[PDB]
Structure formats: structure tokens, C-alpha cells
Amino acid sequence: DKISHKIDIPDSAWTIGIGEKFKNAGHPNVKYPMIDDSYVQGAPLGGFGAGTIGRTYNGGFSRWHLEIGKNKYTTVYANQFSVFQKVEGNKDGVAQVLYAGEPENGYLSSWKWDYPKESGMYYALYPNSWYTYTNKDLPVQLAVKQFSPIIPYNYKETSYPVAVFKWTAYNPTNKNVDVSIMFTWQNMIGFFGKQVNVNSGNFNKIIKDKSKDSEIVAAVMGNISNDNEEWNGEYSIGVKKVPGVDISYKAKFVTTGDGSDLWHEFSKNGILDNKDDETPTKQDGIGSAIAVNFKLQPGQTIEVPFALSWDLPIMKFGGGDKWYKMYTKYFGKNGKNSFAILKEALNNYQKWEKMIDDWQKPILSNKSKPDWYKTALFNELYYLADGGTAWENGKVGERTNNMFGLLECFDYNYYETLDVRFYGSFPLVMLWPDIEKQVMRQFADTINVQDSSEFKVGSNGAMAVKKVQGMIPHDLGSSYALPWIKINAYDWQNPNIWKDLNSKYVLLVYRDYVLTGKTDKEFLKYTWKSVKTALDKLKEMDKDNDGIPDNEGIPDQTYDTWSMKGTSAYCGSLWLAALKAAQEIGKVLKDNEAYIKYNEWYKIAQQNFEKELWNGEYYNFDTESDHKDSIMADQLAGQWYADILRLGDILPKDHVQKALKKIYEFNVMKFENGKMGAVNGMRPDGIVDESDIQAQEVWTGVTYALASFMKYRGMTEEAYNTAYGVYKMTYDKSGKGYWFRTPEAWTKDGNYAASMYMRPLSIWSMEV
Numbered sequence: 001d002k003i004s005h006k007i008d009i010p011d012s013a014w015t016i017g018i019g020e021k022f023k024n025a026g027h028p029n030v031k032y033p034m035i036d037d038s039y040v041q042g043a044p045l046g047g048f049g050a051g052t053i054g055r056t057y058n059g060g061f062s063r064w065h066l067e068i069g070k071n072k073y074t075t076v077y078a079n080q081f082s083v084f085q086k087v088e089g090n091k092d093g094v095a096q097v098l099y100a101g102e103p104e105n106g107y108l109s110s111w112k113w114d115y116p117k118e119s120g121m122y123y124a125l126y127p128n129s130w131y132t133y134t135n136k137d138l139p140v141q142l143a144v145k146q147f148s149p150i151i152p153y154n155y156k157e158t159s160y161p162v163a164v165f166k167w168t169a170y171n172p173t174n175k176n177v178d179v180s181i182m183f184t185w186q187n188m189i190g191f192f193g194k195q196v197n198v199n200s201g202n203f204n205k206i207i208k209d210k211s212k213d214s215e216i217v218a219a220v221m222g223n224i225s226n227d228n229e230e231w232n233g234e235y236s237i238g239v240k241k242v243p244g245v246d247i248s249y250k251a252k253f254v255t256t257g258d259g260s261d262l263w264h265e266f267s268k269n270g271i272l273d274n275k276d277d278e279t280p281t282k283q284d285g286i287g288s289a290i291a292v293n294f295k296l297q298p299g300q301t302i303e304v305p306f307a308l309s310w311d312l313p314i315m316k317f318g319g320g321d322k323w324y325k326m327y328t329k330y331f332g333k334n335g336k337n338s339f340a341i342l343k344e345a346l347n348n349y350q351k352w353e354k355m356i357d358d359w360q361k362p363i364l365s366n367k368s369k370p371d372w373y374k375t376a377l378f379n380e381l382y383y384l385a386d387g388g389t390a391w392e393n394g395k396v397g398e399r400t401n402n403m404f405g406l407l408e409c410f411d412y413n414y415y416e417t418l419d420v421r422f423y424g425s426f427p428l429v430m431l432w433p434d435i436e437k438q439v440m441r442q443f444a445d446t447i448n449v450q451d452s453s454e455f456k457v458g459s460n461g462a463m464a465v466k467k468v469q470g471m472i473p474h475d476l477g478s479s480y481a482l483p484w485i486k487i488n489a490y491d492w493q494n495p496n497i498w499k500d501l502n503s504k505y506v507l508l509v510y511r512d513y514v515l516t517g518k519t520d521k522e523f524l525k526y527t528w529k530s531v532k533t534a535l536d537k538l539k540e541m542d543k544d545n546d547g548i549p550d551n552e553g554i555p556d557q558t559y560d561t562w563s564m565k566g567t568s569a570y571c572g573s574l575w576l577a578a579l580k581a582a583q584e585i586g587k588v589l590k591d592n593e594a595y596i597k598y599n600e601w602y603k604i605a606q607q608n609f610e611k612e613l614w615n616g617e618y619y620n621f622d623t624e625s626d627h628k629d630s631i632m633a634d635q636l637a638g639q640w641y642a643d644i645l646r647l648g649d650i651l652p653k654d655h656v657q658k659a660l661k662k663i664y665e666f667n668v669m670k671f672e673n674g675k676m677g678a679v680n681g682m683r684p685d686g687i688v689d690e691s692d693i694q695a696q697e698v699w700t701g702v703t704y705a706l707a708s709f710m711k712y713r714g715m716t717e718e719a720y721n722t723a724y725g726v727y728k729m730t731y732d733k734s735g736k737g738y739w740f741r742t743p744e745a746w747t748k749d750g751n752y753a754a755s756m757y758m759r760p761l762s763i764w765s766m767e768v
């Protein structure tokens with residue numbers, strides 16, 4: 001491996017061998033259907049709201065999130081980088097697709113498949129990833145750096161449906177070598193959204209943009225129709241000319257054939273026919289190819305950038321609503337702009353690399369932090385793009401704001417699940433705060449919505465009212481229905497009687513003020529009515545007048561199969577913190593009567609909480625359940641947020657410290673020797689609480705948040721050891737292979753529930 005030294009991959013990048021088999025992989029810990037796309041994954045390409053494309057460590061373009069809200073795992077075999085090399089003085093060169101696999105059927109059988117094992121590596125430090133190719137039969141060593149411009153505090157480039165592939169090629173041998181690199185792409189118009197004749201009308205054109213010191217050659221893969229529909233638009237691939245390289249292309253090869261129409265050209269001498277052909281297809285799949293060819297002398301290096309763009313302007317949700325995607329603000333709405341996007345990338349990629357480096361540098365350069373922690377911190381951010389992210393720039397047919405939503409996950413297809421975003425939204429408040437405040441104003445606007453229609457509650461089969469006035473919604477809808485318009489898609493429980501949503505909502509509001517400088521009084525003003533309403537409604541759920549809402553002996557909070565009854569440590573601490581936040585907001589906005597009321601409620605609830613739950617060692621799970629003395633990992637979630645919000649002690653320092661030490665001692669260290677995170681429930685005898693599946697799970701997001709709590713409280717070793725188990729399980733060779741699909745949960749056997757989950761974005765609470 002002589003190529004690594006010629007590129008700059010950080011040591012904290014996650015790494016795996018190209019073609020590596022992973023033996024230990026986990027699978028769903030449930031008996032009903034659940035997504036399991038395998039461990040063959042990678043860091044996504046594509047911006048927020050753009051649709052994303054998962055290119056795996058084996059080289060395939062395989063995890064398709066281009067249909068917003070849907071996860072489709074299928075390798076489009078025509079989509080590849082291929083290489084040709086010929087040593088000066090040999091009769092023949094060699095040609096190889098850079099994919100460690102082959103097609104299932106006989107399409108593209110002429111291409112050279114099965115890139116060999118032990119001949120390259122994949123690296124990822126989101127938004128960047130890299131492949132190196134160090135192969136006995138390829139004397140010139142190659143690497144590629146691939147990325148999209150995901151940039152904190154930038155709402156423009158961060159939205160773009162674009163990816164850059166910056167190639168570096170180096171000749172360590174003492175012979176001249178002819179090298180070609182070829183990008184192939186299928187015209188994927190009709191891959192989704194088209195009900196009949198899925199390829200019909202697809203056609204490919206070549207654009208040559210020749211201007212002083214800037215030659216770009218690109219293929220634009222579109223359809224003859226000017227229909228403005230979800231399925232219509234364009235893909236583009238292309239390359240920028242650099243000194244010492246020639247460009248060749250082929251406009252049209254048949255993807256639903258043996259591929260030899262293209263491959264006989266490339267495998268001969270690495271030079272394509274330069275044949276333009278705009279003839280539209282009927283039934284056959286078609287694709288385009290862009291190649292560079294160059295001669296490398298001994299010791300010579302060359303760099304050449306390719307790019308990929310996709311202009312699919314309209315997202316349609318299952319309820320019928322069609323919206324424009326955010327990037328259309330910058331490039332237009334008509335779906336004929338893929339070249340402009342591609343060109344912008346090829347002329348600006350060096351700047352984008354520097355912008356990415358500039359935001360990663362403060363963490364990467366801090367040598368007090370272990371590399372494993374940086375691996376997790378950056379790579380968990382994949383979910384911000386990969387989470388079915390919707391970011392609208394107007395309803396089709398139809399404002400100053402652009403509504404946003406991140407899915408909880410794909411198995412539970414709900415936007416912005418609030419009980420989860422309480423944990424998962426840290427990267428948005430810390431790196432894209434304008435998006436975060438927008439989402440919270442979306443929630444504010446729903447507080448007094450009433451939808452008196454009824455739904456069947458999944459857990460018990462009773463009927464309930466969809467949305468109650470004054471209760472914060474569980475979610476902002478589903479991609480199968482109407483995101484932003486029809487809220488509370490979730491129906492397993494009735495979220496209108498949840499005891500955590502209203503408090504978490506208030507805590508989220510005050511968090512968003514504090515973590516953006518305590519300057520945004522306008523945001524506090526916009527949300528103030530909803531904050532008062534939320535706490536006032538929750539107060540009414542105090543049945544026994546101890547000043548604290550009563551959990552009802554059903555799952556009435558985020559642990560939606562784990563019953564709480566009476567005063568719970570979890571909802572009770574959240575209520576206390578929420579009251580303290582509202583007091584502070586009241587002070588900021590000069591609402592004296594609110595300050596006084598919430599101060600009084602707080603003082604009464606605080607003393608009762610402590611009396612009812614403090615047991616000498618930790619806070620009891622709750623007051624009334626069968627295993628009320630279980631040690632809960634999240635028992636002091638309210639105090640965690642109070643630390644972040646700088647609200648001080650809601651409970652005595654000494655008791656918080658004792659509780660945290662107990663959780664570390666029991667829920668971490670007595671659960672598989674502390675190598676897997678914090679189990680949610682542990683009995684005081686040191687045995688996992690088996691009262692529900694949830695008690696017996698580590699929740700990845702709960703564990704990272706608890707690590708954050710431990711860290712702020714000076715338990716530095718415990719904090720990082722607690723988080724390490726999550727990192728290990730996700731990324732390490734000894735783990736369960738969950739990279740780029742971090743799940744909600746695992747059980748002690750390592751098997752999982754709900755891959756690709758929002759909650760573990762909470763790792764960013766460790767950077768406050």
C-alpha cells in the first residue's frame with residue numbers, strides 16, 4: 001500500500017477490507033417483520049432533503065433513499081467505477097470493475113466482476129469516505145475520496161443532490177503505465193414512482209462545457225417527458241479535465257443486456273467510442289459512461305474529479321401531497337438541472353473539502369479524545385442525511401420557512417418523533433440550529449390542534465381521539481401518509497396521555513435557546529404559549545395531588561411497552577426540569593405570574609419526588625409497579641437536561657452522583673462486563689429486569705446520553721467506558737456489524753431492534 005501516503009485519511013476513519021466477510025453479524029431480536037439489510041453498507045452520499053444513496057464498502061450503489069421516506073436495498077449493478085491498466089511493453093492491458101461482487105443474473109456478464117479480496121480498503125469519516133485499490137495485477141495504485149458537502153451552519157450546499165469522487169492515481173513501479181478510470185451509471189428515471197412502462201422515454205445526452213481552463217464532459221440521463229411528477233427528472237455523471245488526461249464517453253449502453261457494447265471498448269485500451277445517441281428507449285434499460293485515460297510515468301501522481309448529481313425535484317408522500325425538495329431553491333424546480341448541479345460540484349469541490357476539514361478539525365485535533373470516540377461522533381451523523389429526511393421548498397401547485405423532518409427510523413416511519421428527538425436532535429441544535437428551531441416551531445403550532453376522529457390503539461385495541469388540544473403530538477406524520485399535515489401517525493399507544501411528551505417539548509425549547517447563545521428571545525416568544533399550555537395540561541394528570549403527573553400503569557412514555565405507575569423517576573425528573581425551564585423562560589420574557597406558578601409547582605414536586613423515590617443509593621423506577629425498585633439507566637433524564645440547560649441542581653448533587661455510580665456499577669458493569677452499553681433495567685440483586693423486552697435492552701441513544709450526563713458530572717472514565725460499548729457493538733470487528741445503521745436497541749446476545757434509528761444521534765450531547 002503506497003497510495004495512502006498520497007491522500008489524507010484521518011486515523012479515526014472507520015475501516016474495513018473491500019470484500020471482507022463479517023462473521024458475527026446481528027439480526028432482529030423480534031418475531032415480527034423488521035428491516036435487515038445486512039452489514040454491506042457505507043456512508044451515504046447526498047444532502048439533506050435531497051434523497052440519499054448508500055454506496056457500500058464493497059463499491060456498490062445499494063441503499064436507495066431517493067424516494068423520500070423509503071429504504072430500498074438493491075444493488076444497481078450498472079453503477080460502478082471501473083479501471084483499465086496496461087504496462088508499456090505488454091500486448092494486453094487488464095480491466096476490472098471496482099465491485100467485490102457480481103450480478104445475480106446475466107446482465108452485464110461481459111464486465112469483469114468480483115474485485116478480489118485483500119486488495120483494498122474502505123474508510124469512512126462522514127461526510128467523507130474513501131476506497132484504496134492496492135492490487136497485485138494493477139501496478140498503478142488508486143484511491144478515491146467521495147463526499148457530499150454536508151457543512152454545519154450552511155443550509156445551501158448541505159441540501160444538494162450531489163456527490164464528488166476525487167481520484168488519486170500513483171505509479172510506484174519503474175515502468176510507464178496507461179491508466180483509465182470509468183464511471184458508469186444507469187438512467188434510473190422510473191426506478192421509483194412510475195406505475196407503468198418504467199424505462200419508456202428514457203434518453204441520454206452528452207454535454208461538453210469547454211471554457212478557458214475548465215473542460216467538463218457530462219452525461220445527462222433523463223426522459224423525453226416534461227411532466228412534473230415525482231418520478232421525473234435527471235441524473236448526471238461527469239468529469240473535469242485536468243492536465244495530462246483525455247476524456248472519452250459513451251452516451252448509451254444497454255443495462256438490460258450483456259454490457260459488451262461498452263466493455264469491448266474499455267477492456268481493449270480504456271478508451272470509449274465517444275458515440276452520442278439521444279434515441280429514447282422503450283423497454284430496455286440504458287446507461288451512460290464517462291472515462292479518463294492517462295499515462296503515468298514512474299513516481300508520478302495525478303488527481304482527477306468526477307461527480308454525480310440527481311435532479312428529482314418532487315417528493316410525493318403516500319397521502320398524495322407533493323412538495324418541492326429544498327435544493328430546488330438554488331437550481332430550479334423543472335427537473336432539467338442536473339448538469340448545473342454537477343458543474344457547481346466539479347468547479348467548487350476543493351472549497352467544499354476545505355469547509356468540511358474546517359468543521360471536523362476542532363474535534364480531530366483534540367488529542368485528549370480517543371480516536372474511537374471521533375469515529376462514532378462523525379459517523380453517527382450519517383443518519384441526518386439517511387433518515388428519510390424531508391425539507392420542503394413549497395407544495396406543488398401552491399411562504400418564508402421550509403418545513404423539515406427526520407424520521408425516527410424506517411420500521412416505524414414517523415417524522416420527528418418527539419420522545420426520541422429529545423435525544424436525537426443534538427446535532428441539529430449544535431450544527432444546523434435554524435433547522436432545529438423550525439422543527440420546534442412546527443411542534444409549537446400543533447399544541448392546540450384537536451382532531452376528534454378516533455383510531456384503534458394497537459396495544460389494547462381500544463378507540464381513542466387522534467389529537468387532544470394542549471397535548472404535544474408524538475410525531476408529525478408518516479411518509480406513507482401526510483408529513484406535517486396529519487400528525488400522530490403513531491398508534492401503538494395513545495400519545496395524548498403520555499407523561500413525557502409535554503415536558504420533553506418544554507425542555508427542547510429551552511435547550512434550543514440556551515445552546516444557541518441565550519439570545520433568541522423571539523424563539524422563546526413564539527413558543528411561550530405552547531410551553532405554558534403543555535405544562536398546564538400535564539399538571540391535570542396528577543391524580544393524588546403530590547404535584548407530579550401520575551403514570552397510569554400502562555406504557556405512557558417513550559419506553560412504549562414498559563409500564564410505569566405512580567411517580568416515576570423518568571417522567572418525574574423530566575417534569576421537575578421542565579418546570580425549572582419554564583420558570584427561567586418566564587423570567588426572560590417578564591411573565592411574573594408564570595414564574596411564580598411554576599416556581600411553586602416545582603418546589604412542591606421536588607420535595608415529593610425526593611421523598612417518594614430516593615432510597616439511599618439511587619432513585620426508584622417508580623412508586624407503584626411490581627418491580628418499582630429496579631435501577632433504571634435513564635432514571636435522572638431530567639437532571640441530565642438540566643445540566644445541559646444550566647438550570648442547576650434539581651436533585652441533590654450527592655444523590656445524583658450516587659445514582660450515576662450505581663447505574664455504572666450495575667446497568668453497565670454487570671451487563672456483559674460493561675462491553676455493550678447500559679441495560680435499561682436492572683434489579684438491585686444485579687440481575688437484568690425481565691419484566692419487559694425494553695428493560696432487558698440497551699438503547700443506544702439512552703446510553704450515549706447517559707455517557708454525556710456522566711461526563712458533565714466528572715465521571716470521565718465511566719462516561720467513556722459506557723459509550724465505548726456502543727461504539728464497539730456498532731463499529732468494531734468484535735461487534736455486531738451495525739455501521740451506518742445504528743439501531744435503537746440490542747439484547748445481551750447482541751441482536752437488535754430497529755436499525756437506522758434517530759436516537760443514537762444523542763452522542764453529540766457529549767460535545768456540549
Ligand SMILES: OC[C@H]1O[C@@H](O)[C@H](O)[C@@H](O)[C@@H]1O
Nearest residue numbers: 412417419490558559560744
Ligand atoms: O423503541 C421505542 C420507540 O418505539 C417507536 O415505535 C415509537 O414511535 C417511539 O415513541 C418509542 O420510543
Ligand SMILES: [Ca+2]
Nearest residue numbers: 542544548550
Ligand atoms: Ca401524582
